Amino acid sequence: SADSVRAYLKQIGKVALLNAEEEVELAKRIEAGLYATQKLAELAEKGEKLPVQQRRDMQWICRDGDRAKNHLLEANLRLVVSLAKRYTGRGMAFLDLIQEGNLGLIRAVEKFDYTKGYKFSTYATWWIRQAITRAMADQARTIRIPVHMVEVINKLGRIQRELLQDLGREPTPEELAKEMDITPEKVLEIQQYAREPISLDQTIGDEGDSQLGDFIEDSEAVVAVDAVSFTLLQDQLQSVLETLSEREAGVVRLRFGLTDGQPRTLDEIGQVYGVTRERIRQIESKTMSKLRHPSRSQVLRDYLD
Amino acid sequence: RRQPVTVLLKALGWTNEQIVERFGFSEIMMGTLEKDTTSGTDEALLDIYRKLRPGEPPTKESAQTLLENLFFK
Amino acid sequence: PRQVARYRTDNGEEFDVPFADDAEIPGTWLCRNGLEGTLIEGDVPEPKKVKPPRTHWDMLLERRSVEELEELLKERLDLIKAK
DNA sequence: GCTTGACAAAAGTGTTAAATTGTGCTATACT
C-alpha cells in the first residue's frame, strides 16, 4: 500500500476474530504448553529422560502452546488499533502508539485468566490502554518527565479546565492551588515543568527566511580583548611579586596556586618552608599589607573587572 | 489518471442506452463507450475503486458508498 | 597522575581506561563498545545483587496451582492419544 | 624570628529520614 499504517492494517485484517469458546480454547493450550515446558525443564536438573513417545508429545504440547499465544495475539491486533486511534495528535506517532499497545496486549495474554469466564476484550482493554498511556508519559516529551510528575501536570490541567468553565475565565494560581489542595508556589513550579522546548531550526518570521538557531550567541566563546588583557594582567602580577621577597612571593604564589593553579592550605605551605601554619598566616598578612601599599596596587587597580 | 469519463457514468448505474440517449450529437461520447471494456455498473465501480483505494480489497457495501461518500455525501 | 586499567567485553574486544592512581579501580566498566567489561586484574569481586526477571510461567503459577495444571495437561494428552 | 595551646569556623564523612523515581496493575464488553 501507499501508506505505512495502511500496510499494517492490511496484514492485521488477514486474521479472524475469535468467539468466546475459541479464546477459552487457546487460553488452555497456552497454559498447558507452559506447564509442559516447566515440567520438562525440571527434568533437566535431575535428568530422568522420558520415554520416546512421552518426549515427542511433550515437545508438541509446547510447540502448540506458543502457536496458541501467537494466534490469540494476531486475532486481537484490531483491538489495539481501535484504542490507539483516540490517542493520536498528542505527540506520539500512530504506529508507535499501536506498537506500545501491542506490548500491553502481550501482557494481557500472559496474565489473562480463562476460568473467570469473562470475554478477552474486557481484560485486555485495561492493559492496552495503560500500555499506551504509560508509553506517552515516557516518550512524548523531548525532555522526559517521570510518570508521577506527568500525572500531576495532567490533573492540574483538568482542574484548570473545570475551574475555567465554572468561573467563565481562567483561574489564577491561587484558585488552582486551592482546587487541587497544593501550595500556589507549587502550581507555578509545575507550570514551568509543563513547558515544551522549541525548534532551533524553526524560521522566525515567514517574512525573512531567518532561522532562529543562527541568532543564538555562544556565551562560552573566547573574547579576544579579555584574554589579551588577562595575559597583560598575568604579566603585571609577575612584576609586582618581584618586589616581594623570595619567600614572601613564594608564599603568595603557593597560597593562591598561581604557578600550579592549585591553591594550598596554610599548613601545606608551612611544610615546604618548614614552619607552622600560624607563621605562614603571619607572613601572609604582612605581604598583603605590602601589596596594599599604593606603590604596588596602583598599577593593578584598573583590573577590577 | 487513466480514467474513461464514460466508466463513471456506469459507476452510478446508468445503462448504456441512456448514454446514447443523453450524449446524442456527441461523436466522441459514443465512440468512447464503444472503446471502454467495462461491462456493468458494478464492474466500473470496481475499476474506479482499486485505483482510488489501491491495496484495499473492496466490498459491494464499500464500492457503492465510495462514490456517494466522496462527493454526494 | 593516572593509572590505566583494561577491561574485556563479552565479545572479545578490549579497552584501555585511564584512571587516577589514588582511586579504587572498578571491577566492571561500561565500555565504548556499548557492553559491560570485566577487569583483567584480580577481581572480579561481586555478584552484584542480581534478581531473575519476571517470566510468563511466574504469572501463570500465581493463578493456577500445580495440580490444576496436571489435570489440564491430562486433558490435553488424552485428546492427543485419540487419533 | 618563630612555636604552642585554646578555639571556632569550615570542610568531610557516615548515618537517616524524606523525597523522588520506576513498575506493576486495574476482569461487563468493546477488534
From Swiss-Prot, chain B:
It comes from the Bacteria. Disulfide bonds: none annotated. Mutations in the RRDR sequence (residues 423-449) confer rifampicin (Rif) resistance. Rif blocks transcription initiation but not elongation. The RNAP catalytic core consists of 2 alpha, 1 beta, 1 beta' and 1 omega subunit. When a sigma factor is associated with the core the holoenzyme is formed, which can initiate transcription. Interacts with RbpA, which partially restores Rif-inhibited transcription. DNA-dependent RNA polymerase catalyzes the transcription of DNA into RNA using the four ribonucleoside triphosphates as substrates. This subunit often mutates to generate rifampicin (Rif) resistance. Interaction with RbpA partially restores Rif-inhibited transcription; once the subunit is Rif-resistant however RbpA no longer stimulates transcription. Belongs to the RNA polymerase beta chain family. This is DNA-directed RNA polymerase subunit beta. The gene is rpoB. The chain holds residues 221 to 293 of 1169 of the full protein.
UniProtKB/Swiss-Prot annotation, chain C:
Induction: Constitutively expressed during growth, increases slightly in stationary phase (at protein level). Keywords: Antibiotic resistance, Transcription, Transcription regulation. Binds to RNA polymerase (RNAP), probably stimulating transcriptions from principal, but not alternative sigma factor promoters. Partially restores transcription in the presence of rifampicin (Rif) in vitro; overexpression leads to an increase in the Rif tolerance in vivo, with smaller colonies. Seems to act by removing Rif from its binding site and preventing its further binding. No longer stimulates transcription in Rif-resistant RNA polymerase (with mutations in rpoB). The keyword Transcription applies. It comes from Mycolicibacterium smegmatis (strain ATCC 700084 / mc(2)155). Monomer. Forms a complex with the RNAP catalytic core, specifically with the beta subunit (RpoB); its binding site may overlap with that of Rif. May bind free principal sigma factors. GO terms for molecular function: bacterial-type RNA polymerase core enzyme binding. One of its GO terms (biological process) is response to antibiotic. The gene is rbpA. This is RNA polymerase-binding protein RbpA. The keyword Lipid biosynthesis does not apply. Belongs to the RNA polymerase-binding protein RbpA family.
